[PDB]
Design a protein around this ligand. Structure first.
Ligand SMILES: NC(=O)c1ccc[n+]([C@@H]2O[C@H](COP(=O)([O-])OP(=O)(O)OC[C@H]3O[C@@H](n4cnc5c(N)ncnc54)[C@H](O)[C@@H]3O)[C@@H](O)[C@H]2O)c1
Ligand SMILES: NC(=O)c1ccc[n+]([C@@H]2O[C@H](COP(=O)([O-])OP(=O)(O)OC[C@H]3O[C@@H](n4cnc5c(N)ncnc54)[C@H](O)[C@@H]3O)[C@@H](O)[C@H]2O)c1
Ligand SMILES: NC(=O)c1ccc[n+]([C@@H]2O[C@H](COP(=O)([O-])OP(=O)(O)OC[C@H]3O[C@@H](n4cnc5c(N)ncnc54)[C@H](O)[C@@H]3O)[C@@H](O)[C@H]2O)c1
Ligand SMILES: NC(=O)c1ccc[n+]([C@@H]2O[C@H](COP(=O)([O-])OP(=O)(O)OC[C@H]3O[C@@H](n4cnc5c(N)ncnc54)[C@H](O)[C@@H]3O)[C@@H](O)[C@H]2O)c1
Ligand SMILES: O=Cc1ccc(Oc2ccccc2)c(O)c1
Ligand SMILES: O=Cc1ccc(Oc2ccccc2)c(O)c1
Ligand SMILES: O=Cc1ccc(Oc2ccccc2)c(O)c1
Ligand SMILES: O=Cc1ccc(Oc2ccccc2)c(O)c1
Lengths: 287, 287, 287, 287
């Protein structure tokens, strides 16, 4: 009924960004994707070649309602931030207005004010290297894209939101307890994301009456998951064997939580980490 | 269709039990009230004389679908647990089948298996007495009636519940952080309840595919809350000034979260303490 | 000079009570044993016949400074709490002043005020029964003897303790995370104990300038531990393979931390759960 | 007895680095300071002009034993990392071998292997700006100097340590609960430090048998504390009024904890956050 959500960080339909997009369509929210420049063109190709038709079907006679699809790179806050190499690059040269600020500006100009923000991107150049052999550049690159991205997104997008808006992002338990293969300081990144959620909760709550929470999802065989080193195959088999609920976790599991988290229905919740993981986090010794 | 919920711990319309009842009605769920015999007769007259008429009111013209209302005492697991005095006591003499087991059976015989369970009750003889000054009897009292009852409610009610059912209870932050005024061992009962929710999610999740969670509610001006001597006004005045969301917290705010948690929509959440308190728990220092 | 410590919960030399006793001796602290009457006479013979001779041995030639050894039952707060059967029971008939209050007074009359208190005891009638299958009696039993005793030990022992004294107890991670095998409501008692340590730090810190903390010990092969049916071998084999510190965890490892926490050296620590388990709690997935 | 500790991040004697250095001298550990380049020369001047004589006195006839005092900038891992501006700068031109790697190399060459590491530096260019108006550069600068510094320090210094060595760093509660004035992403930085401690604990434990923990200190009117915006004056008055223990927290309070944390006496502790804050963290509602 004139609800519009922006989802940062889709590349295909095997991630949580898709799951979140499915479920929100059930509540008749219009969807706008933010797609990372280097995969935008291919994503666009697949969409037009119908690769995703099936994944867009919902309930009885309802389709997913994609208002727009835009290039978006969470590396850059303004135009002033893009370096000579990136600008010059084959992926980027063909596109424009993909910075955090340019995307707020562009959405707002095309469609007016929105009321739903989702952060659903992570990126860590050295993810495959354990924390101890992670370099300074790789650590900060991880923090920049995976965590600072959240603050920037909030900082530009509050302007174009209505009061009583909601914002989520996705996190992982590795921030609280040691996950051996989750390297490159994605642990570190997730650590800070959760803490920033509490801090943003305070500022966004008192100064605009906008809520923010994060969802701590169990494992899901996504594009990004397979970039780690298998690891994600072990995480899935372990989860389905030792979690208090022995069923397959689905992107739409997280999706529905996000939708309730994004609705008036959770008015009294903010600054929280909510686990959507079939209860895995509560276990100590595997039985 | 056929979503029946048993709510244990209703005494009036000023409580969280009522907020839950209301919000659950909006979803077209059938409700069954479980009412402590010390207040059961006075609840019935009040109701029959339509004194809750204005509080049964939902949305535009819609009323509350209360299926049945049953005397219920969370102290007694089965008919044999009942001591001679209580069976003979003025307010118990006239009443039948009010133990945890008889209530479970009666619900089954009368209505068949259900799919939702709310634990919404607490008791402590020595609530006015700070923990150090609490006698062994008072402690155990508080533990028995506020913490053990949930365990039992589970034991007897899994029998009459469908797989994929959901169970919630209510807790208070004092379990995690020091709150002067919350005595009797209540903080002890709360800690117990929150840890017991984890262990039960393991059992119920693996053994029956049933979910259990708890809601750490913020302050509400209920009958029970004024029994603390007032502590509650202070705690409300405090939440309304320092929380991120500076807005009155309503029984229905908790209600609608209970609705979510109790529905399929929370499929992948189990064993959790969900905070519904406008974010106060995340604060450290005031301003 | 004049550092006297009362240790509640000693039955043999295979326990944490003994590790604490040993390490405290190295600091030249005077020890007073509090021994459950069901094992008091058998402890005395064993001791007198010098069967603990090799376990009383510290460093190069130094022995254990055991000042006195007293029958003690954490079930009874005062002489009036004692039921006729127990007073008449074979193992209690011969013994005097073994309640929490008489023990406090006797210690004071015999030795004056002390400055250190160890709570090192636990009990649960139904430990073999998983939580869901625990009867109301067993639950309350476990809560009474493992959680309430600490509260009381405080109530009666603050009277005979100097300002700047310190009090510790022992807990187990199962309060925070699900550990199958830990039944009887023990996990409930542990959660209770950890929250009760916070509330008591408030009271004791403001009102008497006395410190209280708890140690979440890792697995140890003690008398009590084999009573769980074995659960303990599994848990040791597990800790030794997956913990960060792959090295046997010894009663004295906990002992020396108890020493630290009990000394002035921990002046600014109160209300905390300190983990001493080679770091196992921080793990999520095995390898 | 041939124990050597390295303390990164002293500038004067009002910080925790001094407190840690005092206490470790009581146990006859030789001390080596790491001093940030821009204050090295002045620090050195004061030392020689005797400004610190009084602050170096310990117990009866013992002085603080400062083995060496070296320039150290946690911004730079190797020689290859220092830029043309810094190299050219007035502070830096007069000094040499101040990178994390060069300091390990230099200590090791002069004095052989050490067994004690302390991390005791924080730095946030935008600390005075709340999280939401913190820029990308300021956020990452905070993370680089305050958190990544820990990993690098461990990464170079393991080489020059003995097995069974210990490492600490200092953190603040703001990582767990909202502290309004603690801006520029020092919250974020502290968040990640605590999470990295658990992760390093795992690698350093399994691969070298070296422990690591962090201490969460209450407020102390230090040089750096006064750089924030007062804020530290409020934090101190609040602490001494509402903490369970109403006494002044001293750098030597933290010091003694560090010393026990750094000794064989805590062999079974790793990967932990330990609160040294007079119990402040346990409170919810101020009484
Ligand atoms: N997949 C899991 O198993 C799992 C478990 C817990 C948490 N999470 C979290 O959920 C989020 C989504 O994960 P996913 O599995 O859906 O991965 P995904 O690959 O499906 O989605 C992440 C997307 O973010 C985009 N992206 C990367 N860098 C970017 C940048 N600099 N600017 C803009 N966009 C960028 C990529 O195009 C990628 O498609 C992640 O942040 C992850 O931390 C995932
Ligand atoms: N009031 C708050 O601010 C607050 C904050 C956090 C959590 N909670 C939780 O909410 C729950 C309900 O509290 P409330 O504030 O709505 O007060 P309430 O009076 O509505 O709830 C207590 C109700 O439980 C019933 N009851 C008491 N003992 C019983 C027994 N032995 N058997 C059956 N029923 C019994 C009484 O009829 C009473 O109506 C409590 O469990 C409390 O832990 C309340
Ligand atoms: N064993 C472990 O692996 C482990 C792990 C974490 C915590 N702990 C804690 O350590 C404590 C001691 O356990 P343990 O493993 O040394 O076994 P233990 O047998 O040494 O300790 C129990 C002792 O308490 C005494 N006791 C029992 N009931 C008593 C009562 N009513 N009054 C007075 N004394 C009584 C018994 O004499 C017995 O010796 C327990 O409280 C437990 O919670 C143990
Ligand atoms: N002071 C408090 O109230 C307080 C409370 C909790 C935690 N802490 C933590 O304790 C630590 C010490 O704090 P403090 O109050 O002693 O401050 P301090 O100023 O006494 O010590 C910090 C020192 O680190 C040095 N430093 C800064 N940037 C550096 C760099 N890039 N490379 C090398 N050295 C650098 C500075 O010279 C400074 O003297 C801090 O990390 C802080 O996060 C402090
Ligand atoms: O299930 C575990 C898991 C899988 C993928 C994740 O996202 C990443 C994005 C980029 C690099 C690394 C991970 C993640 O956060 C957790
Ligand atoms: O706002 C705090 C608060 C108020 C009332 C509560 O219910 C109780 C019912 C009986 C005894 C004690 C508490 C409670 O749990 C928390
Ligand atoms: O290693 C785990 C463990 C083993 C023994 C324990 O002591 C108990 C004493 C009596 C009843 C239950 C437990 C305990 O607390 C934890
Ligand atoms: O007591 C609070 C407090 C004071 C100072 C701190 O260190 C800082 C170092 C550099 C910039 C900002 C803070 C800190 O971490 C916490």
């Amino acid at each position: 009924n004139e609800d519009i959500c922006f989802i940062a960080g889709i590349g295909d339909t095997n991630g949580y960004g898709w799951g979140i997009a499915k479920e929100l369509s059930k509540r008749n929210v219009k969807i706008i994707f933010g797609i990372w420049p280097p995969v935008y063109n291919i994503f666009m190709k697949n969409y037009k070649n119908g690769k995703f038709d099936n994944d867009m079907i919902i309930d009885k006679d309802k389709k997913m309602n994609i208002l727009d699809m835009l290039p978006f790179d969470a590396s850059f806050d303004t135009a002033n931030d893009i370096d000579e190499e990136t600008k010059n690059n084959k992926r980027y040269n063909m596109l424009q207005n993909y910075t955090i600020e340019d995307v707020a500006n562009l959405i707002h100009q095309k469609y007016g004010k929105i009321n739903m923000l989702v952060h659903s991107l992570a990126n860590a150049k050295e993810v495959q290297k354990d924390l101890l052999n992670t370099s300074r550049k790789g650590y900060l690159d991880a923090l920049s894209k995976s965590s600072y991205s959240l603050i920037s997104l909030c900082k530009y997008f509050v302007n174009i939101m209505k009061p009583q808006s909601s914002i989520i992002s996705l996190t992982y338990h590795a921030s609280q307890k040691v996950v051996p293969g989750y390297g490159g300081g994605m642990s570190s990144a997730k650590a800070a994301l959760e803490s920033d959620t509490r801090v943003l909760a305070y500022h966004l709550g008192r100064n605009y009456n906008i809520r923010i929470n994060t969802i701590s999802a169990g494992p899901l065989k996504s594009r990004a998951a397979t970039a780690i080193n298998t690891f994600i195959d072990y995480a899935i088999e372990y989860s389905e064997k030792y979690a208090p609920l022995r069923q397959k976790l689905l992107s739409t599991d997280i999706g529905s939580v996000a939708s309730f988290l994004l609705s008036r229905e959770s008015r009294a919740i903010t600054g929280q980490t909510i686990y959507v993981d079939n209860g895995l986090n509560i276990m100590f010794l595997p039985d």
